[PDB]
Design a protein around this ligand. Structure first.
Ligand SMILES: *CCC(=O)N1CCCc2c(C(=O)NC3(c4ccc(Cl)cc4)COC3)cccc21
Length: 334
């Protein structure tokens, strides 16, 4: 048994399907966002306690904790704006407008060294091949530095992740292409066709020899970071890992969520991966053509649509967030 389950608790303050829930860099605060544009900042250790609440007038699409200033939260809107929110003072410090009408701020990533962040800003969704941009921001001035050219065409970037030092940024796009940016030369080092359909999440492996991706074709793929488009391993996930995520009644009425928040998360050493399913988090060991499901966290009566996995004080915390607005917090020890 890789993990002992110490407890499962429920955070139930959201009354709408969850878009995002991320643990802060200190491993002690959650920021969660639902489809009604309600932001909650909450603690869970030693008890569940709401620290900040606010309903956005404008639609909110993305959420990223600052890396050196634990209390600062970046919020991306659907109206071409990035907000810097102080969770301690419970006030907006900054709102900045993105030029052109690429109003959809789909992705935010803070550099590990705290000096910069990137955001993707996309046109409104009409086809899968809507134009998008990738912007680099300086945290010290909160001013835009540059925009990365995207080849062969401007395209919506769905997901972004920095490596440990912050010299590489991996991206997944609506055209199914993964682009790896050198953040010192500010250029595309590497790009390849990763998925048939949209890329939903990307991450560096612990050892950073590979990047992991999940996409609309239902595939979980591990890529060789030294050889463009060369697969290390590849699995067909069950369909409820990638959606679309559906909550029905007997009304004829249903809610449908295509992935927006992170579809996978990893333990501190990247040996294990948390994924969505209809009834809760499913954890796999990373290493059999059929992938090795070793722990099911359960506890959900509606589809899980986004996950996180945080480790602090030698104790792991799994977030599983479902379309009923419920967030299950499962405590795992090695
Ligand atoms: C948007 C312009 C503005 O009104 N302010 C006032 C307070 C915030 C701010 C900063 C700033 O806090 N810069 C940090 C920082 C910003 C964003 C993140 Cl994600 C992390 C760190 C640099 O250490 C604080 C700078 C300039 C102007 C504004």
């Amino acid at each position: 048994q890789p993990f002992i389950v110490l407890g499962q608790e429920e955070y139930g303050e959201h009354h709408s399907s969850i878009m995002h829930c991320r643990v802060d860099c200190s491993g002690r605060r959650v920021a969660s966002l639902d489809v009604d544009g309600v932001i909650k900042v909450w603690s869970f250790n030693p008890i569940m306690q709401t620290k900040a609440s606010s309903i956005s007038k404008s639609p909110l699409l993305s959420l990223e904790w600052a890396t050196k200033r634990d209390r600062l939260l970046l919020l991306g809107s659907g109206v071409g704006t990035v907000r810097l929110y102080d969770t301690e003072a419970k006030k907006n410090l900054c709102e900045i407008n993105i030029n052109d009408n690429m109003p959809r701020i789909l992705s935010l990533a803070c550099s590990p060294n705290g000096a910069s962040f990137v955001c993707s800003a996309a046109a409104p969704s009409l086809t899968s091949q809507v134009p998008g941009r990738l912007l680099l921001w300086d945290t010290k001035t909160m001013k835009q530095q540059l925009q990365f050219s995207l080849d062969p065409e401007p395209i919506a970037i769905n997901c972004t992740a920095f490596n440990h030092n912050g010299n590489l940024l991996v991206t997944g796009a609506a055209d199914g292409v993964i682009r790896l940016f050198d953040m010192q030369q500010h250029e595309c080092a590497m790009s390849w066709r990763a998925h048939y359909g949209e890329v939903y999440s990307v991450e560096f492996s612990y050892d950073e020899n590979t990047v992991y991706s999940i996409g609309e074709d239902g595939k979980f793929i591990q890529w060789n970071i030294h050889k463009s488009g060369l697969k290390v391993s590849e699995y067909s996930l069950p369909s409820d890992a990638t959606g679309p995520f559906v909550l029905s009644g007997y009304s004829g009425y249903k809610q449908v969520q295509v992935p927006r928040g992170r579809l996978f998360a990893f333990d501190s050493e990247g040996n294990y991966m948390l994924t969505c399913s209809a009834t809760g988090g499913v954890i796999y060991k990373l290493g059999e053509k059929v992938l090795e499901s070793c722990l099911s966290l359960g506890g959900h009566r509606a589809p899980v649509v986004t996950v996180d996995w945080s480790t602090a004080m030698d104790c792991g915390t799994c977030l599983t967030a479902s379309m009923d607005g419920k967030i299950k917090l499962t405590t795992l020890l090695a």
